[model samples]
Target: PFTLPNLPLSSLSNSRAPLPISSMGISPDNVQSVQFQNGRCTLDGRLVGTTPVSLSHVAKIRGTSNGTVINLTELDGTPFHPFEGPAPIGFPDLGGCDWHINMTQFGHSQTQYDVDTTPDTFVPHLGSIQANGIGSGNYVGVLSWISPPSHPSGSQVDLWKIPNYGSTEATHLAPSVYPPGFGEVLVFFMSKMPGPGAYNLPCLLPQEYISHLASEQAPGEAALLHYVDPDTGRNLGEFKAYPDGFLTCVPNGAGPQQLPINGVFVFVSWVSRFYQLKPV
Candidate 1:
């Protein structure tokens, strides 16, 4: 019932097309989900009694080296402010550039949605989300989160390692499902560093997301990690976790390191930058 946004051409002369990033069909039983009804917000099936809860929809636009994105809707169908509140206070963003994308359900703009939602199901009329080629044609999408500033309800980090739908590895690694809750949702799109030197990209996620991974392992238990398969909605069940941060140059010598996905004991390699959009 939902449709994804259309891809926008950055400039008439730009011939490079953006590739579609595969999204997940999230499993409610395995993760926390949010629902909105009667003007009330519910988290993991329970109604939340808090205020100032918000939703954000962000994406990397195609054809712009600066990572510029199309303008989306605000709470009242108006354009969102160029720079808005930070999801995690001081996490790095696109140098104050706005990356917020738009979302519409049925026909109008939305600020909140049900947990079972998938990215392809919603429509982005003005622009579409795309991925940047990391290397060897492999691409990654934004890693997003929905939790408190600190660990509060455990943290939930959703990393879309291979958003490149055309890649052979994408069939199982893509995350198309939407997360539950109505708090500040941040989508980070990674930008390449300046010069030819290798640079480390810092991926910020909610602490609660990693808390779930660590606590689930229990003390002294092997912190085996698994990524959820978007097709079946089940964990792939492999011990190796995904990369947390990204390296501008190949890890020829320094090699790659495993930093926990969010916080706690679990780890993930990295990727993504910024922009904030809300649900209708």
Candidate 2:
């Protein structure tokens, strides 16, 4: 079994990414194994017609010694570390990128709402999707906290929103609302890897920006968050999770959320989400 090396990145372009090898026994033994069979996700309600990607490539973050899943990792021993996977499951074309990585965000544990990828420091909150273009050839994806249960009018302003990196850098994708319950915040970057498979990305997001908010729908009915091509607003897939009538978020809410890239937000999946060319 080969152990994946942990390397710090100076930049996403010139940086080397850590690789994931399943033999590592990556995640913790205390995992809640909820069976998501037949291509379904347990989100906002119950996912049915979506091409759900199973969470399989789980690993312990290297430095989280307290056993609290600070950052998703390779069996994290102390600090914190993520892994290399196939970009994000299903989203938009990162300007025609070929490779992608699954996404998720760090929880503030604030007990209410408010998602911050770098509120304190950076955890690989942002992932990449290689664009099939000339020049830099890179596009960035950020994952924010998705609050499905909060009403935008229910004293929850920044309760569930994406960080606003000023108007200059961030672009909001259309069809903001995720059917039935929550909405998503998607910030896109037309940047690129300094080289192939290079990942130490710079701090692209400004520490502070307002934040985008998505309102909740009904209270008891089932809901669905359709994953589409963020650029053109096209359908690619959908996610269904129970709203704490069964499912929830972190600290007081529930847990760390998974965000899909390739062109998407924070989602927690055991397997690295995204797509790449099939092995020959």
Candidate 3:
């Protein structure tokens, strides 16, 4: 066998960087969480519209901002503010210059997730798929949803399905599965034929392939919210996509505000706007 180079593509430039914040004024720590009680996700301590809101539509609030992001984060000299919908019909986006329609996923913070009242809670220690930074001043611009997911089951969100493989492009399983999502799967199985009657497995899209695919345009964007640790397949933290910037929480926390991570979380707003977003 021979070898040369296996160059991988990487260029989004990462506009989704995390911002530093402080706990005061526009960065009010008093903001509340979007709790999942009984069966539905409660927004801003209140219900949405005439309905209790479904998992796909429910999002944690984050309107507390200091104004810098408001001014610096927008496209046509505007900023991220909470608009009702992305709207009624034909158009549901808050389009002034930037805003459009991004996709979403089922939340992991609500009733079926980390809520106490619920039984399917992944990690009880955490409630409301939370995020905390070394600072403050985050906000929640708009809340949205999607269904059946836009991609296959184990897209970027569950890339860990194949150990240590970073991000892949294969269907549900991975060549890394034997690296073993060991992230070293191919090492053991690469030598064997994955066809006929031996080790039949699927080919992967290679490492960092997901890096190129990571965007607000992604299918299961909400899947990106919690970065799944390849070693355990357990969610480690958030991989959020924001609109230039994001609103982490619009809190009114009367009780302890416990989160699932040590960072801020935002939703995927409009199409291009949110697509232009980076990560934390």
Candidate 4:
């Protein structure tokens, strides 16, 4: 029954005006109900096998009068924030650190594509595993959290996907208990103590680097861009910023529209669309 303190509009110069807290009736104690469940795996839009997953002790969510705050944590109570690295879910092949949620951006509505209807963002480090009796050899599972605008209460709903062994493409993991249309499935519940803004994070990209057009970055200032190891949380060296995001990574216009900063790929389109800032 705790209430979150609201941040002043001036606290973070780049943040959006906080949204009014919806009457979702979420609370701190009920977060235990949130969990990962067994699901059906799909390959190339077809059923393949099944897999087991775990999100417990992986993250914590808090509501605010303005927005939500997600604290990524590890089983040992170590702080496992995405600002430390790229999220472990969206990317298919990148080796990532231990499992943790990326609290970069959150959305107010669900969209048709998993791309960036709203910018927000992670990955798991667990090795490949075989699904029980599914006979898929081995598979790596991926997960994403989705909150529908209609269900502001934040129920156990999400769109989960998994990756095939030695394959670059990912497979959809639909909830088997109660399947929803498309790939929607019951994922996790938001019931942690309410907190303000995103997960506790230092602004990695300075304000000057953000919200600028592609050309704003000088040709010689490429050193500012830093990459981190998604799997080990180590510095992955620096690379020049690509204003168009990941046009160079995949072929046929595939992959996310995000910039690789400090080893984590962050969605830039939502900032461009919502805050009127250029994608960095």
Q: What value does the lDDT take at residue 131 in candidate 4?
A: 18
lDDT tens readout by residue for model 1, 1-280 = 1111112111111000111211212222443322111111111122111111221212221112112222223333343222332111111122111122222333222221111112342112222222221112211122221211112133222222212221222222112223312232212212222222322122222222222222343221111233333344443322221222111111222211221121122223212221111121
* Candidate 4 wrongly placed segments (more than 4 Å): 1-207, 211-224, 227-236, 245-280
Residue 28 lDDT in candidate 2:
19
All candidates' TM-scores? 0.18, 0.18, 0.15, 0.17
Error of 2 at 64 (Å): 25
Model 4 C-alpha lDDT per residue in residues 177-226, reported as the tens digit of each score = 22121211122111212222222111111211222212232221111222
Worst 10 residues of 2 by lDDT: 206-215
Worst 10 residues of 4 by lDDT: 15-24
Per-residue alpha-carbon lDDT of model 2 for 91-156, expressed as tens digits?
Answer: 211111122232332442111112232222222222211121212211122211122212233322
Residue-pair clashes per candidate: 42, 58, 38, 19
| Candidate 1: count of backbone clashes, pairs at least 3 residues apart or interchain | 42
Q: What C-alpha lDDT does candidate 2 achieve relative to the native structure?
A: 0.21
Candidate 2: TM-score? 0.18
Cα error, residue 24 of model 1, in Å, equals 21
Off by over 4 Å in 3: 1-26, 29-224, 227-230, 236-240, 247-280
